[PDB]
Design a protein around this ligand. Sequence first.
Ligand code: G2P
Ligand code: MG
Ligand code: ZN
Lengths: 63, 21, 226, 237, 691, 48, 83, 577
Amino acid sequence: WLSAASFQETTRVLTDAAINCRSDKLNGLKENVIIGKLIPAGTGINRYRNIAVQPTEEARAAA
Amino acid sequence: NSVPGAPNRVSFAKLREPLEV
Amino acid sequence: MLISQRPTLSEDVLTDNRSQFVIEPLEPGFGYTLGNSLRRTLLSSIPGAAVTSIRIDGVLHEFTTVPGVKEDVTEIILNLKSLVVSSEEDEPVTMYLRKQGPGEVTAGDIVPPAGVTVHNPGMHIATLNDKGKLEVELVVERGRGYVPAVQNRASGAEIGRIPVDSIYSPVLKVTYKVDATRVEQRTDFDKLILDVETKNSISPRDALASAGKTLVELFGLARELN
Amino acid sequence: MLISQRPTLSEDVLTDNRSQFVIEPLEPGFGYTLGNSLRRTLLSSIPGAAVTSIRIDGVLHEFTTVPGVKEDVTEIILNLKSLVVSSEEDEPVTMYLRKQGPGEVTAGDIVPPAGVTVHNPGMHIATLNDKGKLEVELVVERGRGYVPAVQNRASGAEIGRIPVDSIYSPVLKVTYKVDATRVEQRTDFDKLILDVETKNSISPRDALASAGKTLVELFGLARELNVEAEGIEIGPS
Amino acid sequence: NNPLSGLTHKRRLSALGPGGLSRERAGLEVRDVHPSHYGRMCPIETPEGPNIGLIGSLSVYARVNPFGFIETPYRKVVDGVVSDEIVYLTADEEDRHVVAQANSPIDADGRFVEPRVLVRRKAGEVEYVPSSEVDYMDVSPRQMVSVATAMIPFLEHDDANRALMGANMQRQAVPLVRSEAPLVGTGMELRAAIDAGDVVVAEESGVIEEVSADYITVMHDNGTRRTYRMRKFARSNHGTCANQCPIVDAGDRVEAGQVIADGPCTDDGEMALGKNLLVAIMPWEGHNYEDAIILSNRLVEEDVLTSIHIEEHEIDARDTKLGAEEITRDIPNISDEVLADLDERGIVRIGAEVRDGDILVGKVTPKGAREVRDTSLKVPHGESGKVIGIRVFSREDEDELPAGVNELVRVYVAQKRKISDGDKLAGRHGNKGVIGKILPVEDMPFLADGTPVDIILNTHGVPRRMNIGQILETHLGWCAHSGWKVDAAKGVPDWAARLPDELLEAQPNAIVSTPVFDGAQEAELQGLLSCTLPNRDGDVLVDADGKAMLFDGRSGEPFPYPVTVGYMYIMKLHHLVDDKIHARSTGPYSMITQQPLGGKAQFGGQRFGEMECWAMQAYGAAYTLQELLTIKSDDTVGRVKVYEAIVKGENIPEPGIPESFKVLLKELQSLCLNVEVLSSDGAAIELREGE
Amino acid sequence: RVQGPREVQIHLVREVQEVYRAQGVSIHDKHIEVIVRQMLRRVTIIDS
Amino acid sequence: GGYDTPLGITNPPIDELLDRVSSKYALVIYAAKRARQINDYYNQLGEGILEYVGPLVEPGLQEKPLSIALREIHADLLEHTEG
Amino acid sequence: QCGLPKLMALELFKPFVMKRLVDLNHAQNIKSAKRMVERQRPQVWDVLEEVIAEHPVLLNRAPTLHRLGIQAFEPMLVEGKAIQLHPLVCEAFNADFDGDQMAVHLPLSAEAQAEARILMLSSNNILSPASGRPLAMPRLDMVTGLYYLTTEVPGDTGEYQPASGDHPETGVYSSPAEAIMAADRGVLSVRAKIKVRLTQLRPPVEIEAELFGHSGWQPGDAWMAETTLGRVMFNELLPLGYPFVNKQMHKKVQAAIINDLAERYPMIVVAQTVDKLKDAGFYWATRSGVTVSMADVLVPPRKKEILDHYEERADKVEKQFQRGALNHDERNEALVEIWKEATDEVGQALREHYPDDNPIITIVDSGATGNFTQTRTLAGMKGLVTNPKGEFIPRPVKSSFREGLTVLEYFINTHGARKGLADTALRTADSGYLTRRLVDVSQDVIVREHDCQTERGIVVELAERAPDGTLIRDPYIETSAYARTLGTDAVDEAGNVIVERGQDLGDPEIDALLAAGITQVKVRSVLTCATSTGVCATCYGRSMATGKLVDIGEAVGIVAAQSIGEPGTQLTMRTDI
RNA sequence: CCGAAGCUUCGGCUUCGGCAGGAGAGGUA
Ligand SMILES: Nc1nc2c(ncn2[C@@H]2O[C@H](COP(=O)(O)CP(=O)(O)OP(=O)(O)O)[C@@H](O)[C@H]2O)c(=O)[nH]1
Ligand SMILES: [Mg+2]
Ligand SMILES: [Zn+2]
């Protein structure tokens, strides 16, 4: 309902969502932008966000 | 023209005018 | 075949403001770059003198009118921009214009100091009816180029001084023309005819010599190696 | 008057016959006053010597192919016009190249007429392959700049004196670019970046050293009409 | 802005208002040029935005019925001869008659020469009927244009869109410190300045008795004496300067209707909105790429394009609760350094130069001291100029002030503004661009005698926009500036048969006039371009084609091909870069949603709209968007820590949660909606901080 | 209903490209397929 | 390649920086995690004892830690694993 | 690079300057440094030159119709109050210089700076993401300069004369330096055909095969060229290993060269090459002699008689209407047809008179700007115009703009300049709505994996055969078959395979397929992907912006919507659509 | 959050003082 309420016809979607007791899982671009989180695209996905970097053994030993 | 003191500005017009604005 | 005749200069006087200079025989090609080298130094870096501030008595800013003069202060200011002044001292000198009564204020009413001479005793500065007097105090200085107005409260001054724009160039118009000699038997040369017209403060042959000193002293950081 | 900031020249040797002089800081506008006149004084004032005519043997008429050699007359001219020669004389001299036999005639074979020298004696002139003989009579004179072939009219003395072009200049390519620098809070200053490429008979540094001595005497005809005139003194070294 | 805009405002017909149309309801059929607009509305002058076709201008000869219907005049014709009797006809009565065309050959007696004439039939149908049915005729060729469109020379050579822009941009010019009349004009400029009313004209005949800089005294022939005062350095509605100057001597004889004093944009009685500049049409190293303009430095050293701008500010003294505010020099919390200006009353002194931060008038609001506040009028950010006048109103000297307030001062500040990079220039034909570069006078192309050019325009923009009137204007301007003389030793040449006898010779710096639809042909221009006079030395710089050979001021060699040279009329537009630059790091914030304020006067930020987020999401930049949306706009707790981290040199912290989301949640909860934020195992989060 | 799902996607990706190709605008077909794919993603129940 | 030396923000060339990584979305995180370590080393050396490593290559006069991180990446002195 | 005013950079970079000012012992406390910064003391103009070093900013112009409406530059301090923009980004920004404004934003953290420096830099975004064509290309002035430079003029000064008897070749040069020295003296023109010995330039393919055969060690191997000087000075701008071109540089040729360089070389040499092409274009535009007068716009030699013959038939139709033969639509039709033939007869009696050097001809014939319809309107005859509905008025406008229209022609001409201006301010509404509706539906399509290993696909036409037996290439094949992944191997006449499953479809693969007698091919398309959420990289194919396979995590949906939407709106504004 | 004033051991502590919404019209790209 968060992504559909901000597109068109706010009153109708809000009324239907209230009657049906809907739940939002916050798994889209618009919802993550609205609540203030990292969008699930580009550098905000799990593979790229959890990269661990440390100097190699040889460089650490040399310096 | 038609003004008491005005600069002399020569014109290229070839038609005459029977009315004033 | 290599030439040996060193270029030689020669002047001819057409008036007291205009003169021509011939410089033959240059090398095939080297006839337009020398002309532009001297024109670009003759129309920029020649020192002179110009007024840099005025102080009328009774006025405070430049957006007002004096009583008895047929112009405001912005037209006396825009009419004090065509005054050809001269100087010999490197320090501000204060002149004085004091005229009164019916008439027309010209440039011959500026009593000069001792070392400054106005070279235009017939320009216009204002018209007076029988109800006004003009007391001005012009400050003359020396310099080079075009410096904009030196602000007031950024120099430690009072509230009556009116800064003014100063143009210090004594030169008016400069051009050249080349007469090429493209014959056979590979004996070619050139010929430049420079024309220098100065305003009235510097003779047409002292500007060429200030540009010749500037260029004989800037092309010396090249022959410093050998 | 003083300049405020004194310009300084610096070099940057890239190769052996190429450099990159930089002159900064220059007052606003003086980067274009010093560029074109240094380029033109560099490419048309330094004296030198070059070949001005050849007389290859066996060509009374049609200049197409010479018996024995594997090259047309135009390639012989192109290879006998890139010779870095120099002469310490005044009037025209004369050189000779006469190699007979299977081989590759090169610049190390023109016997020098005691006074003129060849500085690149490793260039290939032709490849005599079909068992023949080459005989060339060259005329090396001195001059300045690039003079196009002086088509003559001897009508007898020029039995087959092909006239060639003469590259008398010891410099080959100069280019300049004016950039911009900052001195304090004022940008819009200037910086000249020359780029002289020379031959093998002069070094790139004697060029911008003998091109500031034929211009401190060309702009010295002006500072002699009135010695006391007042200018922009540059300052102490 | 200038007299032309004021005159045009009073002649506007608007289709909106309480009883008309709407910008959304109006379609595409109410914004069209109906065939019945001929002589009643101008088809060219109209706005360019959402009000295109909903606003128009009345024509020069039109007049209104006692019912509300617009009329237009015609000449009655009988038996194929045009008479001189004028009858006014409305659009509903001219559809039963055949009306001829203004540009129709008429003999000495008044009979049509051409066998067939172009007329206008019932339903706006144009036809080629044999000339024997005509019943009416036009009065003049400029009957169908308004007062601002009738000021463009060579209008018939321009496309409609470019004439539209030229007419709209003639009303945005600013007055300059010195004015000069066009070299090439149209003749409408004289009666467009008297009727506007910004000049002073004499109501009777007499001799001039006294002339000064601010009053003129005229003695009439009967004995009465009348004196006229002047407005010196008055501020207009848009911050420009309105200055009047006398143009009469001390002994002149004056006739009724003669112009006595000049005005803002007037030169000797005729409107002058720009200056005459020497032009060259050529590309130059890419500095005039894509509608940019290159200027010379002689236009800055000689004050050619300079305008005064005056601004106004005001403070009050409304009695508060405890005590009442009182303007005084005593501002405890401030020292004596920033108090030299303020005189012994609390107001600045006429003549003091102010910066951005200077105190103009100081006021201390009390409590009835050690209770006073620092409430002193300051100069809004980025503003300066000398104080040219004050105006103090007090009720103690008997004055009508709004109840509650006790002191109202009004300060004025003027600043002479020059030309610079980014300022907008324009012409009368649709030329328009900002200034890209200003060059030294030694770096400019120059003619054979050493005269530099003043402005350079690109040649790639002319052919594809179909405004070729500017090149004709430059040719005619050069011919007028230099002066010409036609030889008639062997009779008048064939191309000059129809020229008047006063146009066969002219002096240098002559003024000409080419009416809007009956002017100079092209054979006449081609013949005049080969008769112009030489200069001081016997040289002709511009050849028979209108082209001249120029030298290159940076390298010295001549340009390989001739270039077009001439004179053109250039105006300065009221879109200056000093009024559009803005930047911000931190400043005031809103109240409900704690986002930065909006606008330039309130030190606001720039909107990062919806379309700008799609580009960020398509680039893949997930961290830039998050930082742009949380710690730079709404995260109240993260803004301060971010500032401290930047100042201390540490790492930027992790963003929190925006405040606008909480505002939205309370909005949804106020409509009786049970919206909650759950966790991974129920147990709704509080979402109110506080711990 | 007459043809099947595969022919509606050709009819759509062609009728949309004709309009853009008439005026000389070049867009790859892979950009219209992304949007057409979302227009065919649901099923209508007849009987449950 | 046969390019001239890059200046300013285009050094090191990205066509060689992209040969040490899997895609252009991992280089961003690689550099942005090395830069934070360099800054922490700078801001912890003057206070106490830390566990991070300083710039493995010689810095300039006043260089941003991002530039040092990219220069270290280009010289093949680091290693990383993907989540 | 960009140019940033000092008074704007001071306000944007305030805290970094305050930190540097306190650190460098220029102040005592943070409040003192803040006051000193706010007072513009002369000590803050030197730290604000290493503060802004290597710190990118973002530039934005509204409307933002696609991705390239935001780009990252490196600031430079200039004097003035205006921002300086590179000439080559105006096509992507759609920005002229008659009053536009742009906004600046400042990244703060390390991740934002890294994204701005790596993902968004202007020199990395050259190819358009919707069609793969280059956007940062020479245009307008540069095209004229580079078309003038590389043009061959027959019979010029110092050309090659194959003479005999009197003198030899007379016009063979031994190096480009000698040719330049000769051209500095006036002996030789830049556009005169000569023979010059080239050493550091790569020969064309056929010359290389004829001379060296095995390989050309171009660092020091000499050959012979039959070209002009301008072509040599143009070829010295391309990379070292690029073969000699020897062609006139129409805009199509430049686009082809740029596309080849972009697809076969790294992305840094292309950015370094466009910057040096622009310099030569701007230098040679001012010495090409393109200028507008009123003696260059010429009239058709015999227009009077054409119009007379096409007017007699019109009064004949009129007489026939007076006799009642036709109603009113037939009169209209016949009039229209006569006046739609006369117009193009003037066109074809004007396109021959004009010489091929006239600026008006050489500005539209070089591909810089404009059509020939505008040139016919300006100097020939405007033609039939439309009425307030949509029909053509029988009476034509027979006068050009060079001779001036009359009052009635000018009045009837105003019905087509108002329509365009109302559509410019009304169609953009529908366009915007369309964009916004397209973005929202396809906002959940994201590349999620690398390969779904599906076997389905679609069939692509890929050219058709003529009855004679010669294949005809499909007119629309760049936008339907290029940049795709194969689904099944391409076999022919029960023989071997030319390309294998899982290979990109470039032009070599296309020509190999075409030269074996294969028309129908099966590709992998997004319409038949097996991935549950989002799509996979192999099915999508190749990314148009970079020219390689796609990256896991991109937002294909937004890209697509933007692409589609942009064309429409732009077309509306400039103009049907 | 900013300013003024004190203690200040130099981390900081204390007193006082201070706010920003709608509607309409015209314009630039
Ligand atoms: N979104 C909107 N943009 C507008 C509007 N009006 C003008 N514009 C902008 O004005 C710009 C006009 O671009 P132009 O066609 O004038 C540039 P061009 O070189 O093609 O001009 P010509 O020389 O006439 O060919 C257009 O791109 C818009 O960005 C509007 O109402 N809405
Ligand atoms: Mg624009
Ligand atoms: Zn797939």
